[PDB]
Design brief:
hetero-oligomer of 16 chains; A mainly alpha; B little secondary structure; C mainly alpha; D mainly alpha; E mainly alpha; F mainly alpha; G little secondary structure; H mainly alpha; D: mainly alpha; 2 helices; H: mainly alpha; 39% helix; binds chlorophyll A; binds heme C; binds protoporphyrin IX containing FE; binds 2,5-dibromo-3-isopropyl-6-methylbenzo-1,4-quinone; photosynthesis (chains D, L); transport (chains D, L); Cytochrome b6-f complex subunit 5 (chains D, L); thylakoid (chains D, L)
């Protein structure tokens, strides 16, 4: 009963950066913080 | 054996609780898996594995004892409507060439309910199940959503017989609170070779019993008191686990819409950021 | 397995409308 | 068809979160 | 057209600050209004009676323009808010809120959590499942092992002597009538009090 | 049962999102 | 630079107040009651016992001009007469008093379906003769499906001088 | 920006309003999922066609594991009970206790943190049931 | 003892004048909390369904701890608040309360009356008395008229057409879930607004 | 009391508080009766025999008579409906219409009164015990 | 007659709606009352009047017509449990001396259900009912609260017979669209005296009919066309009304408590005024 | 016994009202 | 004239907060359940069908050492054995697993009431032998009331070496 | 159907004075007024 | 049905308690 | 009928505790 959801775990958790990045990336375009 | 079940409680093998008759007899204690895809589509042939543990390193006794080959069996509740894929389809042999055995229903009719006559052994430990998915539009008697899937897999000799008496793969106890002064082990000419015994219980009525061939042994006399309980040895390796699950059928025009809806949010929660700060150079003007 | 062969897709595809839109008014 | 874009839908959707990343304002 | 009225004006009365996590609070709440709806939406079709219930839920999934949907959501949204909530606690402890003036918007909050958790336990057994059944035929005994009329209390849950039809009706009325009011109240307290702020940085 | 990981992980994203992975933006925005 | 012409955002929320309708037509559609088929739900005269009522419930159990009504199609309290010509009659009125709702009973006597609540009056086909009821009722078609006594709608010509389909 | 008139203690510096037309950005974005998740993984009825005997499992509410675990976990006593009821009550007494720090939070004084980044390492350690591998992934 | 204080000091303000009876407003309300209680108090044993209703009410009256009492009150208190209310209107119209300061607290009030009246119609048919039955099997036809704004609407009361398993549940959920919330809301509006007096002079 | 602040028009003289420990005198006193009544006169049994019967006893409560009466009272038309729905709506439009009243005895006036002490003489005239060809026995 | 009812629908006279069989035959149209005390006590003999209007000034026909004596009958549903007072009790004759007739049950057993064989006439128009109240403690099968009481009172000859054919107290119509050219009224020797008739309907088949003795008359010939409808006169005066009601039984220890509760309020809402303004000479001090 | 003090209870109870009759200060 | 000693009003509200308790003990008493008859209720092994279950439900329908349980007293899932000595056995255990709640089933085999959920283990009188269950169960008294198989409580001495009443 | 309640009408209505009086009567005892 | 008079009267107490029987304490506290 | 033979009673009987009570503190 581990395997199945077990991948869905770290699964989502990764996507947390996945977007977080972009969120920022969209910034080096319209006036946020430097680098 | 699988069949055995319907020869006593044929309306269905799944007890009201959640267990399958298998244990009301041939009782074991090993693992077992039955995994299949999250969502499967209607009118579709798809996978269904039924892994069955224990390192092949294993080799049990036999009917006569002679330590030899091992065998694997099972039973399975597919969801109401779900049947065994049609020959024609079964997309290429890529499928066919894995599970090539006999899958018969339980009570006459139940296609979602399947047993597996064919007991491959140290061969088919995956026992794949080519299964087709029903169409709930060709038949309004068929509905969607998640549906239960239950399984009770066996192996190793029975410990109990359908006849109504002890098997081999197990232990042969007794009855006697007193130190058994002797034995009675021997053999037989032809199809037989027994291994009797002689307890003592000199404490009144000197009772004894009859253990058969099969199980090995241990200690002897000078003791073996206790209260006249268990036997000398137990061979059983019987393997019976059990895993339940569930699979979903999905109305595509039902996934589309939900998706077609995302893109709206996808856009909405966007324009919603588009304006706002992304257009606030207004107060950021004075 | 592919999956990203999708995230990379759909995902960015809406991104590819986002950065684009400013280009319209800012530019 | 969408045996895989089944959930590929949901992952390529945390986007909302992604919007709330462009959060800032000095005022 | 704009009419004076009962006054009105910039009801909003104070700026925010500089932070991001903080959000789940409102988020947790959100999922509620999803449950209040979905939930309610069902008070029109659910049959909290011995005989029916299960045979009745089959009716919601079965047909009902989108039953499965409302339900499913409710189910997720439910077990989802309870997640969003827990994090809301982290966001908090991880920072503060439990100190001197909000010396309560936290505590009240606590209660908010019991109610919440409690919503499940009840609704969670309504379906008449085997899981939903027993697992509240077991949590109904929790209060029996008690001194005095601590024992003569567990009943206030099950209604019957063991689990008589009652057990249901008590729960239902609770899940749909009782709790759905307290949580309300405490949320208000939780908010009302919340006429404060935070952030300890540069 | 999926759900388990659909949160035994997403939430655990919080601390590395605060605990031993973030809030320090105040224990670093100021060490002296 | 400048604002002034702040028209555009009618999409800003013109779309927002769109994401709403989307997630709602589904819900509002939801509280809406369906229907599987047409005129035949509990059509087998099912007298409340989930029973596919059989024709022998009306014959010996009844007699000559015996008047007891059954469950009608859709739900209606529809009437089922008995024949003094051994078998039975092939129809039954929508007892649903056309005036208000009072299921008007037959007169063990003079045969004029006088409503109880306001003494309306009918005949052997519903049609009103004395106010307050304004109109007849709707008959059906008796049969033997699986032995049931199945009932149905209307839009045709009859034995003597009938009427005209006043619904649709 | 920080203010000058009002000049209090624990007040409000800056940013104001315009987040409530993003809260909706939150809200909505915070809805969608409960949706999609449903679809991809809807809910269901079950074998209780008219239910009654001791199931093989009984997956108690999908969170109340710890509190559950405990309940069973320890051989009898209202200890099972109490200790569990010590999760709500025992907690309500925190702001009273870890209120030592007149100012800088219990992150400064980890003496709270640790027990937390722990009274939560045990907590998960209680989201623990079924029959899988411990020395196998 | 005080703490994170607020107005924890001055509130004892606000001066009136020697005007007899005219409590109708608050009074009306009163009887409500009597119904909210009594009413609720019953959500615990009322088994609302096709039939497990009448046979169930017999259970409240004959066989349960003061049932008759709770019920009876509820019954009176009900048909009583509705009286106290009407007079509350008189007190009003005959004072010039809405006047000009606020006539919405009046209008809202109006709504308050539909809800109230509506509470009966529903609950009033719950025990399925032959009286309670039919008289809501008749008021369910009222809307079968009007450009579908009524026709394909009346259903939203009973289910689809007739009366039976649905007509009830819709009502119940309403009497116990819907209305019991609106009235609340509008009472609040009614009160909240009420920050603008009923008259003045020398 | 009075002098110079609330230059609006909402009286705040000299009685304050101490009525809330009489409101309870109200409340309580306003409770007793529903008991005196309930216990003096209990509730009613039900019936439960026929679905399609018809009780010589019909009707609603004294409060839905007029509205009821009307419903029936007049031969068909949404007029029955409308006119009745004209009891709530039609009313909500009063403060708009009968809107003036000043100093003196802003407690009366008549062009409103009469129609009232009348639009309430009819109202009772609608609390009508059935059968009635409209009156006189 | 009362009995008549149980000779066709004996399970109970009260139809599922609310009317009593009486009208499914002998149909009338007069008033009727059945009032009894608000609350009656358990194990108690109490009153129950059944007034029956029409000024005694009335005198109907008869079986043979001869305008004579009038008679009053009835039926009544007392509440489940309620029975007819015991002789012994019936506190003094003050009671006894009003209603002294035979009150028999309907279906064998139902004491709360009573008929009244004895039809006094212009004598007993009150038809008093001495009735005892049950005790719901000697019998837990008996409960309190309000309970229904229904009644259907008759009088005047029947209009319909239990035989299955027209009575006397009523109109006797016909069938003939054409001016009836004559009559046929006469008499009979002994127990009988008929009053036939002879319509005409020369318009084809000259049909006619048979009206009996009893009803008076009106006009004759030169007309009487119409379409051959109603008769000459209607004698019926039959009087059948119907009033329903309800009475309460009260657990005294249930009235006490409610009262014992008043006195608390009685005192509370007092001390609550006692303090307050009745002790405000405080601010009324500065 | 209390065949008559049945309601005599309720009439001799409007008392509450009677309390709300006493309400005189002077400010 | 003067105030000062404002003690008395402890009756002012001491009575008020009296009118409360009066109108409440009744209510609070209310939410408190109902009782049953020491003769009948659901004690007649009523297996859910409101039935006063008779003794012939356990005999031929069963056999030798046949183990199927009925509805127990109060509600409990109480066990009812059959005798291979023709008639039947005079008691039945409170299957209610003393450990948690899982109605522990009999072992068609070795006879040790192994609980399913955590494999507890019992004997022919409940008593636990293998954890996690800490204690026995409670038997009863079979009978023939109106032919029912009525069941009852406990506090006495038995055949061999029994135990001691661990409840009250 | 008149008689019965018909007395309960004027019944109560009378009691309205019944107490109202006393309410005042209790005043010629502890300091009321006639302005 | 009692209730009727239990209010067809108590309420009617209001106008003689205001209407043509009271409020005038302002149309009499001041006639000129 | 008597009724007042009761109001006059019960009623006044509580009155007869009222006027009495001031007599205790005022006097
Ligand atoms: C001039 C002054 C005057 C004054 C002061 C009053 C004062 C009053 N009148 Mg009145 N009246 C007057 C003139 C006046 N009237 C005239 C001239 C007429 C003649 C037509 C009436 C006719 C009248 C009637 C017929 C009734 C009153 C009633 C009432 C009072 C009770 C209030 C109430 O709750 O209504 C009660 C209102 C209702 C029950 C209506 C509900 C109707 C339902 C079925 C539908 C509502 C539809 C809704 C708007 C739809 C929206 C749906 C949404 C989703 C959009 C009240 C204080 C009512 C009363 O006393 O009832 C016991 C009542 O029934 N009056
Ligand atoms: C009998 C002695 C009275 C009198 C004279 C009044 N009430 Fe009540 N009342 C209740 C509620 C919930 C409100 C709403 C308050 C608001 O909107 O502010 C009121 C309101 C009033 C007012 C208006 C007050 C204001 O400050 O603006 C007035 C003048 C008033 N009441 C007089 C509730 C109740 C009761 C339930 C506990 C009872 C009893 C009463 N009121 C009784 C009276
Ligand atoms: C469940 C429906 C069920 C399955 C599956 C099953 C399988 C099974 C296998 C695969 C074997 C052979 C093992 C070997 O290696 O020799 C086997 C053997 C026996 N079984 Fe079985 N069995 C199921 C159910 C049951 C039931 C309900 C009973 C009792 C009535 C039972 C008994 C036995 C016995 C005895 C044997 C051994 C036969 C032999 O090898 O001589 N089984 N089973
Ligand atoms: C109801 C149960 C019922 C009552 C009561 C009742 C009474 C009644 C009386 C008191 C008379 C005599 C009147 C007189 O002054 O001569 C009377 C007469 C007749 N009835 Fe009757 N009756 C009741 C019920 C019924 C029913 C249901 C029928 C029909 C089947 C019926 C018929 C008649 C007839 C005929 C007569 C007249 C007898 C005669 O005077 O020759 N009644 N009834
Ligand atoms: C006893 C009894 C009472 Br008293 C009653 O009021 C009613 C209806 C009028 C609801 C019915 Br019916 C009934 O049987
Ligand atoms: S409902 Fe039939 S006459 Fe009125
Ligand atoms: S309840 Fe039986 S082992 Fe846990």
């Amino acid at each position: 009963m581990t395997e199945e959801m077990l991948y869905a775990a770290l699964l989502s958790f990764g996507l947390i950066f996945v977007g977080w990045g972009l969120g920022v990336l969209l910034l080096k375009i319209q006036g946020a913080e430097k680098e | 054996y699988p069949f055995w079940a319907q020869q006593t409680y044929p309306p269905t093998p799944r007890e009201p609780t959640g267990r399958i008759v298998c244990a009301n007899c041939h009782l074991a204690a090993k693992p077992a898996e039955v995994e299949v895809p999250q969502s499967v589509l209607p009118d579709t042939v798809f996978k269904a594995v039924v892994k069955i543990p224990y390192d092949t390193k294993l080799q049990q006794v036999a009917a006569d004892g002679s330590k030899v080959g091992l065998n694997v069996g099972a039973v399975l509740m597919l969801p109401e409507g779900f049947k065994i894929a049609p020959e024609e389809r079964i997309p290429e042999e890529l499928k066919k060439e894995v599970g090539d055995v006999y899958f018969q229903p339980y009570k006459e009719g139940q296609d979602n309910v399947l047993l597996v006559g064919p007991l491959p052994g140290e061969q088919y430990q995956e026992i794949v199940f080519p299964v087709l998915s029903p169409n709930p539009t060709t038949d309004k008697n068929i509905h969607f959503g998640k549906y239960a899937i239950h399984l009770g897999a066996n192996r190793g000799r029975g410990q109990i017989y359908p006849t109504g008496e002890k098997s081999n793969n197990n232990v042969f106890t007794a009855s006697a609170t007193g130190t058994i002064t002797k034995i009675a082990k021997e053999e037989d000419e032809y199809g037989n070779v027994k291994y009797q015994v002689s307890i003592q219980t000199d404490s009144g009525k000197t009772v004894v019993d009859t253990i058969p061939a099969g199980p090995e042994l241990i200690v002897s006399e000078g003791q073996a008191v206790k209260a006249g309980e268990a036997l000398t040895n137990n061979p059983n390796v019987g393997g019976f686990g059990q895993d339940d699950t569930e699979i979903v059928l999905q109305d595509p025009n039902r996934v589309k819409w939900m998706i077609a809806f995302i893109c709206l949010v996808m856009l909405a929660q966007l324009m919603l950021i588009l304006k706002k700060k992304q257009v606030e150079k207004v107060q950021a003007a004075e | 397995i592919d999956v990203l062969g999708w995230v990379a897709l759909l995902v960015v595809f809406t991104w590819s409308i986002a950065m684009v839109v400013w280009g319209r008014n800012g530019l | 068809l969408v045996l895989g874009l089944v959930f590929a839908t949901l992952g390529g959707l945390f986007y909302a979160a992604y919007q709330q990343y462009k959060r800032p304002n000095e005022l | 057209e704009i009419q004076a009225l009962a006054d009105d004006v910039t009801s909003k009365y104070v700026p925010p600050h500089v932070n991001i996590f903080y959000c789940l609070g409102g988020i947790t709440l959100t999922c509620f209004l999803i449950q209040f709806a979905t939930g309610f939406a069902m008070t029109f079709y659910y049959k909290p009676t011995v005989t029916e219930a299960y045979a009745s839920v089959q009716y919601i999934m079965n047909e009902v323009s989108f039953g499965w949907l409302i339900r499913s959501i409710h189910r997720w949204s439910a077990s989802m808010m309870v997640l969003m909530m827990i994090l809301h606690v982290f966001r908090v402890y991880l920072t503060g809120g439990f100190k001197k003036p909000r010396e309560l918007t936290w505590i009240s909050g606590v209660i908010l959590a019991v109610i919440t958790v409690s919503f499940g336990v009840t609704g969670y057994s309504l379906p008449w499942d085997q899981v939903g059944y027993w697992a509240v035929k077991i949590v109904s005994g929790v209060p029996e092992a008690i001194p005095v009329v601590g024992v003569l209390i567990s009943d206030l849950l099950r209604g019957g002597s063991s689990v008589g039809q009652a057990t249901l009706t008590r729960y239902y009325s609770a899940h749909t009538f009782v709790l759905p009011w307290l949580i309300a109240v405490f949320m208000l307290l939780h908010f009302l009090m919340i006429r404060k702020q935070g952030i300890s940085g540069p | 049962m999926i759900l388990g990981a659909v949160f035994y992980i997403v939430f655990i994203a919080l601390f590395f999102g605060i605990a031993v992975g973030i809030i320090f933006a105040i224990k670093s925005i100021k060490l002296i | 630079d400048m604002g002034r012409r702040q028209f555009m955002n009618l999409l800003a929320f013109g779309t927002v107040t769109g994401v709403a309708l989307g997630a709602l037509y589904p819900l509002v559609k939801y509280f809406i009651p369906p229907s599987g088929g047409a005129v035949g739900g509990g059509t087998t005269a099912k007298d409340k016992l989930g029973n596919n009522v059989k024709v022998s419930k009306f014959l010996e159990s009844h007699n000559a001009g015996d008047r007891v009504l059954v469950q009608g199609l859709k739900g209606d309290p529809t009437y089922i007469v008995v024949e003094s010509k051994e078998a039975i009659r092939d129809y039954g009125i929508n007892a649903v008093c056309t005036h208000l709702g009072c299921v008007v009973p037959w007169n063990a006597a003079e045969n004029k379906f006088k409503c109880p609540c306001h003494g309306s009056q009918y005949d052997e086909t519903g049609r009103v003769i004395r106010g307050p009821a304004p109109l007849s009722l709707a008959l059906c078609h008796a049969t033997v499906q699986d032995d049931n006594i199945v009932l149905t709608p209307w839009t045709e010509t009859d034995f003597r001088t009938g009427e005209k389909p006043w619904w649709v | 920006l920080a203010k000058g008139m009002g000049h209090n203690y624990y007040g409000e510096p800056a940013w104001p309003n315009d987040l409530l037309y993003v809260f909706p950005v939150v809200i909505m974005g915070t809805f969608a999922c409960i949706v999609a998740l449903s679809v991809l993984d809807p809910a269901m009825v079950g074998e209780p066609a008219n239910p009654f005997a001791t199931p093989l499992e009984i997956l108690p509410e999908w969170y109340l594991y710890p509190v559950f675990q405990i309940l069973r976990s320890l051989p009898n006593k209202l200890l099972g009970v109490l200790l569990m009821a010590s999760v709500p009550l025992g907690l309500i007494l925190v702001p009273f206790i870890e209120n030592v720090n007149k100012f800088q939070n219990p992150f400064r004084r980890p003496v709270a943190t640790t027990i937390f980044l722990f009274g939560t390492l045990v907590t998960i350690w209680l989201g623990i049931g079924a029959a899988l591998p411990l020395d196998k992934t």
